[PDB]
Amino acid sequence: VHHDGFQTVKATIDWEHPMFKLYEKAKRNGKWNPADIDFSQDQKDFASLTSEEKISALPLVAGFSAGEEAVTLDILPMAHALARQGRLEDVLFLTTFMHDEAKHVEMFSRWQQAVGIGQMDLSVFHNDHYKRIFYEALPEAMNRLYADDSPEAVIRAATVYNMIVEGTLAESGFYTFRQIYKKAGLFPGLLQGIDYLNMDEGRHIQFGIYTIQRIVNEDERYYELFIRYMDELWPHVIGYVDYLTELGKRQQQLARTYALEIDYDLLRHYVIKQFNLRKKQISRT
């Protein structure tokens, strides 16, 4: 529909808005380019591995590649909803959020291309719980915003996207990469990419917290909805984590060859810790 007028004609950008300040940080801190990462040692590393050692990292990379692609596509309805609400500074920030995710998609795909598994269909490592989150719950909650931008809808979208997918699963995946492959001295280009992704995703979670909290500030009853929506998704989070753990325990050749001690119980507790920590970052009041 039509534009009634424009904020930067009637007035200016709200220079003190928290999302404008986050937009400014994103420009300053967002200059990295996946095209500059040297994957040449990753290629040699991957080639040096046996077939059974090779597959060890792929379930995780499969989860990330799909995840980054999903969040790239599925942030667009949130940007649209906030734009229609006239929240210009949120929109400015979300352009950096979307461009970040584009780079994240690119980073993992560049890695797959470099190590020679670009032609492999990694969908085999998406179990039912993963599909329930990334193929279904995430796009459903986001696409809802095109026809229902109520506070309930916006909280549910930010919960699934920012607090579960990014704030629980992605953060735990970064930790896992460091606990396993950084200890093995493997895939230095991928691990460089992970470090840049982790920095970007700190801003993304701040936007989710800002968005949920500002709606909770309007009516404390929305706090109960946030907790409920978190708890609804937990079975699929831990169902996917348990699936990745089972795969890891059934193919132990990389851990043995590299004399690693992968504590899968420690990884499980980190996911639980992230989930609970995300809940603690929203307050009823």
Place this chain on the structure above:
Amino acid sequence: VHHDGFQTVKATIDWEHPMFKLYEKAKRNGKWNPADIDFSQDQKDFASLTSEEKISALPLVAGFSAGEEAVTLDILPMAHALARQGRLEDVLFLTTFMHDEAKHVEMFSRWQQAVGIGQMDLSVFHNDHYKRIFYEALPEAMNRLYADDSPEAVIRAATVYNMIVEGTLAESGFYTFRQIYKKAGLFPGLLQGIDYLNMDEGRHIQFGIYTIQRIVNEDERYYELFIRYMDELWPHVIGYVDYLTELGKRQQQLARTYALEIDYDLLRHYVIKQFNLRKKQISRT
């Protein structure tokens, strides 16, 4: 609705896609930050103008500030339409397109703030023809894509957005800024911004040309639609240009003060030429 699968899990990014190459160029060439522009001399320049010279500058800035804000919001439906079509490389590029427009909004608003007119409502310089394009025709054509992503809808959207708004009006506005203020020595920060904007917008127009031409390549009958949609908006393009000209001719102190021969007939001929050049960037075959 649901994702059926993910391109970067089943395969990789299409590294040779034209919009991937444009995305790569956008990252390499899109590092500028409006927050680094020094507007201190612009502020002194504006303060030194008489009231009658001050307002001479503002119709153009009013047209740009609203325009950049409009195109920042109104690109989201195109990104959604192409995402839904599975055009991943197009989406990656459009994240750079959207973020560029955010910086363009920011640049003009920072200028307005710096020179002391942030509080002034510049909407008074939007005549009926301007409103018909930016308040109405542009958002209508873009929002259509949420419910109708037919080739006809996509061509109309890219025509209004990329070939008229950007390719005819913004390009002529950049030329106009340089014809008036570059020779005068005035507003060096704004002119620095204009130079960065013009570089960004060169990439943007290539996406519009790519998009229109790939649809024309499937059926030459869409070429006649493109020409029709351009001609449909021409009356409002020239109606706005004639309005700005009338404001310019009715206030000549800034030219006299700065020894400018502001050839308003030359600016009009530039707009006509731009319009015809954009039509010629699309080929029937």
